[PDB]
Amino acid sequence: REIVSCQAGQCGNQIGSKFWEVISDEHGVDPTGTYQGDSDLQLERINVYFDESSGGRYVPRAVLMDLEPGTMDSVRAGPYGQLFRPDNFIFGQSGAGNNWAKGHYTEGAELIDSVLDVCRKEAESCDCLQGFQLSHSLGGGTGSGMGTLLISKLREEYPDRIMMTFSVIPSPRVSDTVVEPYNTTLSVHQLVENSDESMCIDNEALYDICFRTLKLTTPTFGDLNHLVAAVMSGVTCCLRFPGQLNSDLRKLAVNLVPFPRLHFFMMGFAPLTSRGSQQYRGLSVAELTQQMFDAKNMMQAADPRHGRYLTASALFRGRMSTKEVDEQMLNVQNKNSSYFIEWIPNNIKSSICDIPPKGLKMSVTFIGNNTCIQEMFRRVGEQFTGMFRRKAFLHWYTGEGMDEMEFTEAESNMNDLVSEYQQYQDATV
Amino acid sequence: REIVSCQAGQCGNQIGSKFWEVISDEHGVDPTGTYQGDSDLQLERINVYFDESSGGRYVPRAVLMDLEPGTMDSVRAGPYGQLFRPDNFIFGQSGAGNNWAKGHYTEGAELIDSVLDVCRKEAESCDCLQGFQLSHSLGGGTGSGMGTLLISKLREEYPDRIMMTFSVIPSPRVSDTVVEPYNTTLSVHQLVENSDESMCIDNEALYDICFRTLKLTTPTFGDLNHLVAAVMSGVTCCLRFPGQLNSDLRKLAVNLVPFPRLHFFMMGFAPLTSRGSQQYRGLSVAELTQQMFDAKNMMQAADPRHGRYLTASALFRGRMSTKEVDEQMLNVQNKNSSYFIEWIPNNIKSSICDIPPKGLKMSVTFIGNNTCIQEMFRRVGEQFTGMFRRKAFLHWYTGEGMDEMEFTEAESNMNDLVSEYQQYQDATV
Amino acid sequence: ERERRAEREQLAETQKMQAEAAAERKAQLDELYKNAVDEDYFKYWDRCL
Amino acid sequence: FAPEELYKNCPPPVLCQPGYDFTPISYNTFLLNPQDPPHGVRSVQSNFMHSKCDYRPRSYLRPEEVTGTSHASRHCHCNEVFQLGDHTMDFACEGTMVDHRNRL
Amino acid sequence: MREAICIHIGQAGCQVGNACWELFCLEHGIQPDGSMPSDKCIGVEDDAFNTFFSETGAGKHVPRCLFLDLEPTVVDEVRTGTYRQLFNPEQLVSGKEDAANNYARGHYTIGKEIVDLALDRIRKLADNCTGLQGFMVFHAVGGGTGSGLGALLLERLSVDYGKKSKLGYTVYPSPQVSTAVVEPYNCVLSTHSLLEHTDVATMLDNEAIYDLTRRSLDIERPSYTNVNRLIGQVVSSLTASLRFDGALNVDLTEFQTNLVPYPRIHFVLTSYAPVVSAEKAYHEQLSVADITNSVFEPAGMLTKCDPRHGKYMSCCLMYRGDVVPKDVNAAIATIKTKRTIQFVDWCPTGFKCGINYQPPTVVPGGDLAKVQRAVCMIANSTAIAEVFARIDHKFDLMYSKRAFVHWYVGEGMEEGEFSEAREDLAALEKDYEEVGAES
Amino acid sequence: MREAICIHIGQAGCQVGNACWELFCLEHGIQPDGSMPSDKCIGVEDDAFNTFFSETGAGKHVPRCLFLDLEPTVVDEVRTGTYRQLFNPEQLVSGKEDAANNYARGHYTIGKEIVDLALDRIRKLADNCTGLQGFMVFHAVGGGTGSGLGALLLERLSVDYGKKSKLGYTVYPSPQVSTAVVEPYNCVLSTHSLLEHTDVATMLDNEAIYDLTRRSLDIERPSYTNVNRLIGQVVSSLTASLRFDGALNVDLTEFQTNLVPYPRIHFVLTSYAPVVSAEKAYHEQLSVADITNSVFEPAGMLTKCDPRHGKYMSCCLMYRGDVVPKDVNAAIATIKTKRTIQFVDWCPTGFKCGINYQPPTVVPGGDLAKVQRAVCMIANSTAIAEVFARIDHKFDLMYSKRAFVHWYVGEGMEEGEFSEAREDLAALEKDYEEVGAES
Amino acid sequence: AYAQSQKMQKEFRLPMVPGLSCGEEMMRRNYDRS
Ligand SMILES: Nc1nc2c(ncn2[C@@H]2O[C@H](COP(=O)(O)OP(=O)(O)OP(=O)(O)O)[C@@H](O)[C@H]2O)c(=O)[nH]1
């Protein structure tokens, strides 16, 4: 069971670089590709993310994407950038300019052929591919357009494979680009059509984690990418390591997706604490379940308390007692049924992985299909309506030949998704 | 079981020189003609390409041809020039002048008599030869003209024995002359019913092999010729070395020629790894087969998307198991059967040889008969119609005793060949 | 019967030995099957001659 | 070689790829013929055997609960009832043709 | 002879079987290498272990089991565990892709293609087993593999084995402890197959075992290993009659008839006593009356089903150790007088007794205190309707909006399956209250 | 006496002959130079090797084999191999150039100029043998030589030696794995000749060997060497009855009349078990019943053909080792009690058994495990119609618009030969289904 | 292998009556026919 990852754009590529650093640290793989792990559990299922070469070098199952070659060059310069295969760096000459039309129709299309070649060959290199992973930013041009164009042609070739997308939706007060609403709206419907599970990321709540939970004095993009890499590695803990109650991406999808269009998840991590408060914190299953459900701990800028939890998933890692890891879920359901959907009894799935991240007695990743995603989608919808009403920046997108009708298509699909979540929130027994 | 080779033109002479360097290295023959190989397998079948003299020197079974004596001097002054027999250097005083008519009717005829004298002497000197090999470029004057005249005379003299020719079809994007259409057409309509089998070479594909597979800095003609040499060595390896699954030129001809006029093949090599990505990729039978069937790995510049494989042949060298060298052929025949035709089932011929090329533990040469090979013929025919419609550059050919009827017949034969390839390009099920 | 039991024990020990021998046999076969390239693979390339 | 003559009273080999990387063949089961001793020949036994009566088919006098069908629901279409080309067969008839001691 | 074939479907089944074979090797003195060292207490040529361990002729014993799972983690972990030398390389089937908590996927797509080689292993065990008693299948219907593939295997075993006993020791979902959302779907869908092709189905939910360990064992934080050890103890107590000498020797098929009153009523609760810790033990005079009372205690069952909510239909007590018929009959008389334990009117006898002289043996590190006598409970009661009612009400709640049904459709199920399973559960519970009604 | 002349034609024939002769030398204690160094317990003047090795006045033994091939690399490698002094300088006929995967090339042009020499070698082999049992021919019809030259040699041997037994362990094309493209043409053309001039032909394809070695022998990457070693083991097991004493001694011609119901019905399934690695050899108690069941299993078959898709018209089991006739009867009885495997209605007996007391060997260089007993089935079943229908459908697809037909017709074969051989195979499959039909 | 068993068998010299002895022809040096 193998999953091959593709990281697209500047944001996606740096997130993937941090994620591969995390995974290499997990499996005891140094940047030169050798294996200096301290246990054979890191070697038993190292084939999930790494492919062994003739010399024993463990090449990551990674495909890199961009239009600006500077992102590829910086990734290669990264501390673990020497791990990736040189031919897996596919790049262009001119950037996307935050333009979804160039990322999806003109520059991406003229470049995605070699990308599909690399993805196809690496997929066939796997004995039995468990899934495809993608990391990208919806606000950007080459991350959103090229990533969506990737998943569109990967879904058609592998209909039953798990599409594991990590899309970084821009936030209003964290925004640094004006065509971000356009790119996000044009990418949301593609994500809906061509993703088994889309797990959103927002820099607003990432910075919230860095400033209030971790109390970092100056968090850069590296800390945000580390927080994303946390969940990116924790979702496959049962895949890579044994456990009392194993799971996988498809089990998570079946337990978290009640209907095909409802596959947008809001996530979290635990444990996470500041440097000064870490000697005062006694790690326990109770503390982990306290932090995993905290609204502030969520790395999405959509308030959990406003919506209702369709489904929840607890990927616990480490040696812990099973009746209490289940009880911390049943108890929270019983005392907070108002936070959960009535007609879906037992909203919480729990899974146990034997091996936690080294240095941690136990950790947990939370996966939540809350009905509050429609709020963070409706914010983007409001921004998109405001920009689209006055033909703002439409000439840049129509220069490549993309259509006002396709803008309306994206808007209608996003509104349909938002109203879908709202109707399933307010539906009663 | 032996093959006697001929080089025609400057391109053919350089390619043959590189091929003889490769063969001498494989058989452990230094330029002075002695033997320093460290295996009995190099001597057991060294008679395929080399004839022993009174003093033990191994003279290659090679006949060199060019109206220009400059390339004769260059090849005899090269590092392996002393290897060839002095009397086999057959040359004229005035060059072919990039004229098929001059190289086939006026100046080629006055030298083809001595050429056939030399080839007949070598053929009868050796015992019982599998056949004749020739290397040339169709865009030249003497490589195409004298090459085709040689092929015709050898079909007159030895139809019993196989005929294999390596023709370097020019491409407009590599075109360094203007009479590529005339020369290529006047050569191909000869090779259709003269050469027993003719695999195609394009410098356009040779250039980007050095990029998408080698990523090397300075590609030259000598750099290109090594690919042709390696594929020749892989083609004729099984005659010189033992193998689990043995094959020879007649076996390939039978397995790759369904109809007599469909004998033009598309050819490739594997592995083709770069210095930077040498240690990154783990070479195995799966990677070898994927590189065989990769479109960009072909050393002829015709797109295999637009055609369907009439037949295919994989000539593996090295130490590999048989079930996983047949199972990967089964794997491709299943995964991408749209490349293949249904009326001829199980389109893949396979051979196994125990001796790989120097520097490889596993290697393979791929020869495919596809309906896509007519793309180069169509493009050359379009250029030919453009030039011949206005009678451009036809006075040179008509002043050397040739008439317009030869061009008309050449165009008719080229169109017939293109049509009979395009018969099965439709993706019927 | 007890001597046949002893011979079955001897066959078991022989099977231990054959299984071990096949183990290093398969290891050596894998080592030979692994593909690597030395300098003479590239010596023809990167030279402008 | 049509299925409804080949497997009149036998489960067809439903093919599955896993277990082979190559063409799958078939997998024999532990389904036993009912006791048909030769007429007059003694009960001769070379070695201990599995008794036929201990493996009598469950569809013997299986009670019909839906008035007309011994099958409870359409998992009979997964276990008992198999589709063989243009014909449909049921192994529930085996219980009718066998006795309480697994004899024809 | 008198062998029994153990089948372990899914993660829960595989781990339960791991604990069961732990306990079996401890009981029969078999090392993880697969050989039995010479011991003075056990005589030579004493092949009482062959009911579970086929003897290879070279001094090694191989368990008569089949670890079937669609996901390679658990089987590979067994292959790298302590009993890698004990367990055969075959009968250890590994899938490549998990059923993913989907009954439809485990019953129609991957089960349909792994079950025939599972049957290969089953037949290769059965031909060796000359006097096979039956198949003991361990699985949890709440998962995907254990529900779908387990039901498919147990369903196809019927045609090719006939009247062979089917002891399905099934882990149904608990009222509160839930590790899945589609668990009601899987349980309801597999319940019909259990009804049709299960001779005796034993209730083994997790919450009741957790509460039992928290209360009686003074263990604040039990786990799957604890619950699997307790399940293995119950299994060994049930199967010890055909393994050791006993006053009332019973087989797998002996309690079949005494436990199943009607063809569609074969679900059955279970319990064990004295399930106490070492600290607890030396303060109690664990007599036969005491252990019988603790068995009949409503807190002591392995399922969250209160017997006081229904009529007892058929109880069966398996005593082990120095137990005496004097004491067992005194205990039965006291239990019958004890008036919350009311038997249905049409079943006056209602009692089955099996006495075996072999006391239970504790595994090293096990929380069970070593005892001279111990009694297990396997009892069919009309109160079983509790769990079925709660599970199919959860099924109704999920099915009102047709949630999570797109997955079951996507791995090859028609909603006719869901519907018929629904009225099958409804009619089953109607049968429960109908047999509970007085004449 | 009781000699059997080996005729290895083509590359595949040469490889399987090398494996077979290595195995035979290990059987008879014959060193690669061709002599027994010193044997005290093995009594002197005891000649059980006469059927495979002919003695010389110098005490050296020469195999009774003819390695006939049209191309020199394989024969030259065999010449330079370990058995330099063992294999005869003659009887090792090598041509000048290969048949180019062309039946016409191997049967009309280069086959004609070598068949006379091959027959002279065969006569020099046969005149030595005073009790020649028959000719064991090893070839693959997929290639050019093994099809055409094999056909020519069998055609002339038939008229030269009358009704001498001919056992052809032939390698027909596999369902989907092929090492050639004109392989269906070669197979269809060669089957016509083989029908008239082949007493019994035995399935020896490649996919079944690959799958069997991957599953049971537990090696990830088997190859032609392992396939040839398994083929040699099968051949030695079949021919050991006339080499060693046994309860049921059988000759090569003895099962000719028992396995061939009709003159056109002579293509037979082959099975061999226990073909297991030493990893599981001690794990499994390989009794007579177990090995018989594994042999009868279609998974353990040595061709990719389905016995359950046909009816066993006849079977011939060869037990090798310490197999008791009582155990043979028990295995046969438990096989007849089965339902999945069924005989035709007109052949109630359908069974032949032959017991040899010599245990099978283990060959260094091979992955087989030493066992005190084994058994090889040679069985005629109607299932061969499936593989012949597959290959002739491939032939019809190829010959529909006459692909690769100019190559065959150029050598000198009639263009109508393709068609006429095709009606031959049509009648062959027709009589297959009609003999499988009931009365 | 079958050395001490054969020695004790020939020392005991049981008369040829069914049931007392078995596997005599399996207790052999080798099965090479002459
Ligand atoms: N008693 C007990 N129950 C277990 C154990 N492990 C898992 N379970 C139960 O199994 C349920 C999880 O579903 P499983 O049936 O184990 O899943 P599976 O069998 O691997 O099949 P998939 O869901 O497709 O992976 C949990 O709710 C537990 O109640 C165990 O060790 N002991």
Ligand SMILES: Nc1nc2c(ncn2[C@@H]2O[C@H](COP(=O)(O)OP(=O)(O)OP(=O)(O)O)[C@@H](O)[C@H]2O)c(=O)[nH]1
């Ligand atoms: N078992 C086995 N079969 C082989 C071997 N070599 C070739 N074959 C068979 O030969 C068939 C293909 O024919 P060829 O490769 O032409 O070999 P051939 O039949 O002897 O004929 P020629 O080699 O042309 O003389 C394949 O389908 C294989 O089954 C081998 O080493 N072992």
Ligand SMILES: Nc1nc2c(ncn2[C@@H]2O[C@H](COP(=O)(O)OP(=O)(O)O)[C@@H](O)[C@H]2O)c(=O)[nH]1
């Ligand atoms: N978490 C995180 N966000 C990033 C990173 N780099 C860029 N972003 C976000 O991505 C948005 C712009 O995306 P962009 O760089 O245009 O994507 P691209 O065009 O595909 O390369 C900004 O609003 C950033 O907040 C990163 O390394 N980590």
Ligand SMILES: Nc1nc2c(ncn2[C@@H]2O[C@H](COP(=O)(O)OP(=O)(O)O)[C@@H](O)[C@H]2O)c(=O)[nH]1
């Ligand atoms: N691969 C390769 N191509 C060559 C070489 N020399 C010339 N060519 C090609 O051949 C074409 C010219 O052919 P030419 O040498 O004039 O043919 P000639 O007149 O018969 O000798 C050019 O377009 C080149 O691309 C060489 O050494 N290697």
Ligand SMILES: [Mg+2]
């Ligand atoms: Mg599982």
Ligand SMILES: [Mg+2]
């Ligand atoms: Mg050959």
